[PDB]
């Protein structure tokens, strides 16, 4: 929501897709992150990209 | 959140070696020694006239 809100301030269209599925965070190779664990448990630190 | 980092003992940098060098003194121009050119010129005339 905040990303979509910020995109409109940038004048860019919000994130949208069609078909059965869901929205989630992924790595540069496309692998999705764990949905039930803390970012402190995963190997995420300041300055990472997702 | 950040990854911890402890600084170890610094590794040896490459040592600089100064040098003292004395330049070679230039060559000296040979003073103008001189042949009695006219004497041999008269000579070859005299023997020829004989």
CB A35 within 8 A of CB A26: no
Backbone phi and psi for residue B20, each to the nearest 5 degrees, phi listed first? -105, 120
Task: Work out how many CB contacts closer than 8 A connect A with B.
Answer: 6
**Separation of alpha carbons A42 and B5, rounded Å:** 19
Which DSSP symbol is given to A30? S
**Separation of alpha carbons A8 and B1, rounded Å:** 30
A-chain CB neighbours of B1 within 8 Å are 40, 45-46
B-chain CB neighbours of A46 within 8 Å are 1-2
Shortest distance between the Cα of A19 and any Cα of chain B, in A, equals: 37
**Separation of alpha carbons A20 and A41, rounded Å:** 29
> Which method was used?
cryo-EM
Lookup: tokens for A11: 């004048």
Shortest distance between the Cα of B3 and any Cα of chain A, in A, equals: 7
């Amino acid at each position: 929501k905040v990303v979509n809100s910020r995109l409109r301030e940038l004048g860019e269209a919000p994130l949208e897709a069609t078909g059965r599925g869901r929205w989630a965070l992924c790595l540069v190779d496309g692998a999705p992150l764990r949905a039930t664990q803390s970012l402190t448990e995963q190997d995420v630190y300041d300055g990472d990209r997702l | 959140m950040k990854r911890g980092f402890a600084r170890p003992t610094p590794e040896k940098p490459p040592v600089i070696k100064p040098e003292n060098i004395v330049l070679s003194t230039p060559l000296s121009i040979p003073p103008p020694e001189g042949k009695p050119w006219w004497l041999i010129v008269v000579g070859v005339v005299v023997v020829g006239l004989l």
